[PDB]
């Protein structure tokens, strides 16, 4: 009982328009990044805690770019995974570790800010302790991901087979997680989602709260100060709704146990909607923080 | 002005312990370090211990390594040094000296009055000259030898003169190669090369009567010399 | 009455014109012009000392080129080891708005001056190992420009109210006053001789000084704007100028006009520092646009360029053997260039 | 206003009896003292044995 | 050698003692102070409690460091550059030399305000405007008509009126309404709340810098 | 078995 697949898990306007989408998004960010990184490397009066994390947050997205859109883009396209294993172990390593980084840079710029509004008196950190965070937020990130990288190993399928336009077959391939038991992968993808999606959104929610409660309670005044409330609630929302509908998805198939047909269903057209939004935040980030600030508007 | 005293010393049992103590007034003590120095009652010197500015790097010698402990206190102006075990050679007078380091300092500038105590590679300098008869209106020389080059890439050399006049402390006379020292006449210059090196006075006088020492400057492990006396009949 | 002086006035000085006149045979650029160019010359950092946190703007070598003295609106002094780059003394001041500073050559006394009026003298070699203060200046109504030693005991100032001092130390009075000038006086350098000196005004005017008798000998104009810098030649009969109008000039003592000027159509910014080097053949500039220039000093093509600071250069000096320079900007940081 | 006068014509008139010289022949003279070892900043005069380091 | 390393330890504890002293000194608040001849600038500088003339007092944890440079004579522009951080410039203008003369005393120090505001070293930097005499200034209103000043001026003979008209015309002059802002406040010979008023201007300029200088806008 | 896309 051999199962026939595809070269081509789509038709061809869908590859057509999804391959359009992925290269504009990607084309944008290279630009944005770049410009962003440029701009800060330039001037030396330009030497503050808020550039440098700026300027890390520019790389972080640089690497999501360069390390992530292409694999998921080709891996998606076609139905196997035309990968060996070392590949396989590499981008599951570099994928944790760039969305990570980023997202806990997007958290630490937050905290300076909050630390800066709301309290100007207390003494204002200097260079090395940005150089400290920056480390311990890059190494607790690798630490983090390394046991997902010890366990994912690529396994060859003894009754399926792949098929091209011009009837010439082809072996396929799984880049998957071997456990030693199937009962503790639903940990790890909880203790992922608790580490990754939970505690930065919570945090940012919370203390952009404050911020805006201690703003409000201090005509053209109110008016900026309007304005500030709008930028904090819009990239609060940006994130959360962002980045909401991929965790959402892994969880339900870790969990809720979807169906034959309703897998089918999930595995070829939901996946790419949350992948594409998860990397067109990662995107835009650069045009929010960068055209937004006069001092890289110069 | 700048007044330096010591208190204790006297008779103690062998394996006993002692603590020493040095105090100043008025020539800011914040910014000196110290040394010690220990002279045999029959002759020759010898280096104990040195402490820096801010109680930095602290310095012993290899006899003293493991029994003598140095410390001091910018506030009231003070050091102390204790002895934990005491020896049969360990009976000798002590000397506290001042020091601060800078491009145009004068280490080894002022001297104590010094305690006395009974308890009842590195480098060589020779100094074979012991004593040699002179009478007053002609001029000296006194020849001391080293063992290594003392002259560093730096340029400059590090060679110590003192003089000891009988029942008075070792006062400063050369700190460097050809660098006289205040509160001296100009009848004294060293003008020395190479790894021998000499002292040269033109003319004696009455208070020309001591003992002269030789010091180098260039490996922490300091070492004296034998002494040059001028009897001056 | 007055009418008649002022006729008499306008009558001499038309004399002196045409006596200065009459007497321009022949131009320096026009004798300079077969000579062999030095080429192009390029120069690069060689140490850089960091201890500072605020707008330098005064600096001095020592008589040995090997330690210097350096002034900040902190309110601190600094004295420093060019060669180790360790730091001797720390001064403390009781006035933080200084803007010169100057080293004795024996090397036994500090000066500093500013906009408190007052020009304070301390004294390095004591008995007990630490800076304490010897005399306090005080007698001009306007605000310190620039001071310099002549030896232990006397020394030279030169204020905003127009004039120029020269006092001895011992008694802190007022030996001989140079009176003069219309504008603010803004810079001084002694002769090698230690017998004359120059200074430099705000009305575009330079002046010579005689320190024994005590008035001026001869003065020289041609510049549109502020005079912000003065230097002495070694030879000890030339000197060089610069200006707020984006030029330098050179004079001579024995000619009694203007020779020869470096400016340039694209150099808009003012000069703020000046100093020659030895041989007379460097000529180092400090600008407003955060560089430092070498020029030639007997063509007005410019020589070389340099730039490593992030903001004004406001301070230059060169050892007494014109073997490297110290530059000192408003970036809090001092750098030596070889 | 008379003392202004009386001075610039007392100094700027027994001086015009004093005598004057072309600066090139001072600048002749002094360069005599440049092109040579008195002399290490134009071009790369010094040996690469400086004082300073490099 | 050995007196290398000294010297090196030497020099790294003065620069330990060099770092710990402006740290400290770079958390004080600085004032310039300027002004035309008689006016506030002496009555203000008493009630807060030869060259450069220094006040220092603390208020609610802030220590205020005054500069008074009046008894200079000499030319303002080649000193101008020193005070080019200072947080603020307290310019005291009279209000009552409408009448006396001296070539209006008004109209110089207007000349005065509108020099100093649009100098090219103070761009960021805020000022704040002192009227200084009031008290008496209802009795020569009620005595002496406005006209003599202000030809141009029409209005009531209240105090209200000419104050306000006053305040408005001296503010016109400001060319730049978007970097920095002017503010204004009435101050009599008996009061004892400028301290507070300067406190909460010195309070809001911090704010503003901060939030400006590296987070939003 | 599990032919499904990766995470991230």
């Given at each position: 009982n051999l199962t026939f697949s595809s070269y081509y898990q789509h038709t061809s306007p869908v590859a057509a328009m999804f391959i359009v989408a992925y290269a504009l998004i990607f084309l944008l960010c290279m630009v944005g990044n770049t410009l962003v990184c440029f701009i800060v490397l330039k001037n030396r009066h330009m030497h503050t805690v808020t550039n440098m994390f700026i300027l890390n947050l520019a790389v972080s997205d640089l690497l999501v770019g360069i390390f992530c859109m292409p694999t998921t883009l080709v891996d998606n396209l076609i139905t196997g995974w035309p990968f060996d294993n070392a590949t396989c172990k590499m981008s599951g390593l570099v994928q944790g570790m760039s969305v990570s980084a980023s997202v806990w840079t997007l958290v630490a710029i937050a905290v300076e800010r909050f630390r800066?509004?709301?309290?100007?008196?207390?003494?204002?950190?200097?260079?090395?302790?940005?150089?400290?965070?920056?480390?311990?937020?890059?190494?607790?990130?690798?630490?983090?991901?390394?046991?997902?990288?010890?366990?994912?190993?690529?396994?060859?399928?003894?009754?399926?087979?792949?098929?091209?336009?011009?009837?010439?077959?082809?072996?396929?391939?799984?880049?998957?997680?071997?456990?030693?038991?199937?009962?503790?992968?639903?940990?790890?993808?909880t203790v992922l989602f608790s580490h990754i999606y939970l505690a930065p959104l919570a945090l940012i929610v919370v203390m952009y709260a404050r911020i805006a409660r201690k703003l409000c309670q201090a005509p053209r005044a109110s008016r900026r100060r309007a304005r500030v409330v709008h930028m904090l609630v819009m990239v609060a929302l940006f994130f959360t709704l962002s980045w909401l509908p991929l965790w959402a998805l892994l969880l339900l198939i870790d969990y809720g146990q979807l169906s034959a047909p309703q897998l089918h269903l999930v595995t070829v057209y939901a996946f790419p909607f949350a992948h594409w939004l998860a990397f067109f935040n990662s995107s835009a980030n650069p045009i929010i923080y960068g055209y937004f600030n006069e001092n890289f508007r110069r | 002005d700048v007044q330096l005293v010591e208190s204790g010393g006297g008779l103690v049992q062998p394996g006993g312990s002692r603590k020493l103590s040095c105090s100043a007034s008025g020539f800011a003590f914040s910014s000196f370090g110290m040394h010690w120095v220990r002279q045999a009652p029959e002759k020759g010197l010898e280096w104990v211990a040195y402490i820096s500015s801010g109680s930095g790097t602290i310095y012993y010698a290899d006899t003293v390594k493991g029994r003598f402990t140095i410390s001091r206190d910018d506030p009231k102006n003070t050091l102390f040094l204790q002895m934990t075990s005491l020896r049969s050679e360990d009976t000798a007078m002590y000397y506290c000296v001042r020091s601060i380091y800078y491009y145009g300092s004068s280490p080894f500038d002022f001297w104590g009055q010094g305690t006395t105590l009974t308890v009842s590679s590195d480098i060589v300098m020779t100094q074979a000259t012991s004593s040699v008869p002179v009478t007053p209106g002609e001029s000296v020389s006194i020849?001391?030898?080293?063992?290594?080059?003392?002259?560093?890439?730096?340029?400059?050399?590090?060679?110590?003169?003192?003089?000891?006049?009988?029942?008075?402390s070792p006062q400063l006379l050369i700190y460097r190669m050809s660098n006289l020292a205040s509160g001296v006449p100009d009848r004294f210059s060293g003008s020395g090369s190479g790894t021998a090196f000499t002292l040269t006075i033109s003319r004696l006088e009455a208070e020309d009567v001591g003992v002269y020492y030789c010091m180098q400057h260039l490996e922490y492990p300091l070492t004296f010399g034998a002494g040059t006396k001028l009897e001056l009949k | 009455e007055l009418d008649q002086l002022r006729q008499e006035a306008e009558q001499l000085k038309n004399?002196?014109?045409?006596?200065?006149?009459?007497?321009?045979?022949?131009?320096?650029?026009?004798?300079?012009?077969?000579?062999?160019?030095?080429?192009?010359?390029?120069?690069?950092?060689?140490?850089?000392?960091?201890?500072?946190?605020?707008?330098?703007?005064?600096?001095?070598?020592?008589?040995?080129?090997?330690?210097?003295?350096?002034?900040?609106?902190?309110?601190?002094?600094?004295?420093?080891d060019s060669y180790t780059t360790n730091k001797v003394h720390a001064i403390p001041l009781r006035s933080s708005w200084v803007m010169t500073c100057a080293y004795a050559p024996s090397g036994n006394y500090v000066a500093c001056g500013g906009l408190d009026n007052i020009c304070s003298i301390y004294n390095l070699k004591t008995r007990e190992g630490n800076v304490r203060v010897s005399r306090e200046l005080a007698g001009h109504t306007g605000y310190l420009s620039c001071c310099r030693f002549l030896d232990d005991n006397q020394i030279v100032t030169s204020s905003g109210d127009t004039t120029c001092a020269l006092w001895d130390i011992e008694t802190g009075q007022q030996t001989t006053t140079f009176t003069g000038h219309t504008g603010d006086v803004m810079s001084l350098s002694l002769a090698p001789d230690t017998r004359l000196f120059v200074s430099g005004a705000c009305d575009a005017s330079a002046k010579l000084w005689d320190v024994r008798e005590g008035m001026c000998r001869q003065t020289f104009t041609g510049h549109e704007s502020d005079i912000n810098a003065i230097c002495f030649f070694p030879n000890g009969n030339a000197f060089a100028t610069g200006s707020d109008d984006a030029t330098c000039?050179?004079?001579?003592?024995?000619?009694?006009?203007?020779?020869?000027?470096?400016?340039?159509?694209?150099?808009?910014?003012?000069?703020?520092?000046?100093?020659?080097?030895?041989?007379?053949?460097?000529?180092?500039?400090?600008?407003?646009?955060?560089?430092?220039?070498?020029?030639?000093?007997?063509?007005?093509?410019?020589?070389?360029?340099?730039?490593?600071?992030?903001?004004?250069?406001?301070?230059?000096?060169?050892?007494?053997?014109?073997?490297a320079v110290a530059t000192g900007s408003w970036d809090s940081f001092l750098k030596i260039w070889n | 206003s008379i003392a202004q006068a009386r001075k610039l014509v007392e100094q700027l008139k027994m001086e015009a009896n004093i005598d004057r010289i072309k600066v090139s022949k001072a600048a002749a003279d002094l360069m005599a003292y440049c092109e040579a070892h008195a002399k290490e900043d134009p071009l790369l005069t010094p040996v690469p044995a400086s004082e300073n380091p490099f | 050698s050995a007196e290398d390393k000294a010297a090196v330890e030497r020099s790294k504890m003065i620069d330990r003692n060099l770092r710990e002293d402006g740290e400290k000194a770079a958390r004080e608040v600085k004032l310039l102070l300027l002004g035309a001849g008689e006016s506030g600038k002496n009555t203000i500088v008493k009630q807060m409690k030869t060259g450069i003339v220094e006040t220092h007092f603390t208020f609610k944890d802030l220590h205020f460091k005054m500069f008074d440079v009046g008894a200079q004579r000499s030319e303002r522009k080649k000193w101008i550059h020193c005070f080019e951080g200072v947080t603020a410039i307290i310019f005291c203008v009279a209000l009552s030399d409408y009448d006396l003369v001296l070539m209006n005393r008004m109209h110089e120090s207007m000349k005065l305000f509108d020099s100093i505001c649009n100098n090219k070293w103070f761009t960021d930097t805020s000022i704040i405007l002192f009227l200084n005499k009031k008290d008496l200034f209802e009795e020569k209103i009620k005595k002496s008509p406005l006209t003599i000043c202000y030809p141009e001026y029409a209005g009531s003979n209240t105090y209200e009126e000419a104050a306000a008209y006053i305040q408005c015309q001296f503010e016109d002059l400001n060319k730049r309404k978007d970097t920095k802002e002017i503010y204004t406040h009435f101050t009599c010979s008996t009061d004892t709340k400028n301290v507070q008023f300067v406190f909460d201007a010195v309070t809001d300029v911090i704010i503003k810098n901060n939030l400006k200088d590296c987070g939003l806008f | 078995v599990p032919n499904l896309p990766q995470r991230f």
């Open positions: 800066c509004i709301v309290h100007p008196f207390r003494e204002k950190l200097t260079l090395r302790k940005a150089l400290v965070t920056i480390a311990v937020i890059w190494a607790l990130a690798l630490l983090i991901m390394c046991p997902s990288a010890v366990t994912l190993t690529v396994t060859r399928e003894e009754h399926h087979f792949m098929v091209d336009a011009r009837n010439r077959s082809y072996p396929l391939y799984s880049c998957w997680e071997a456990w030693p038991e199937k009962g503790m992968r639903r940990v790890y993808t | 020849s001391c030898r080293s063992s290594k080059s003392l002259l560093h890439s730096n340029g400059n050399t590090y060679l110590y003169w003192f003089l000891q006049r009988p029942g008075q | 004399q002196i014109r045409d006596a200065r006149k009459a007497c321009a045979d022949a131009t320096l650029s026009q004798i300079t012009n077969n000579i062999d160019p030095v080429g192009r010359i390029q120069m690069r950092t060689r140490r850089t000392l960091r201890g500072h946190l605020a707008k330098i703007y005064a600096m001095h070598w020592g008589t040995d080129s090997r330690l210097l003295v350096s002034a900040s609106q902190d309110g601190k002094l600094i004295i420093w000039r050179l004079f001579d003592l024995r000619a009694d006009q203007e020779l020869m000027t470096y400016s340039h159509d694209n150099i808009i910014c003012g000069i703020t520092s000046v100093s020659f080097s030895k041989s007379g053949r460097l000529l180092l500039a400090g600008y407003d646009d955060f560089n430092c220039n070498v020029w030639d000093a007997l063509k007005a093509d410019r020589a070389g360029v340099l730039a490593g600071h992030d903001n004004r250069v406001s301070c230059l000096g060169v050892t007494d053997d014109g073997m | - | - | -």
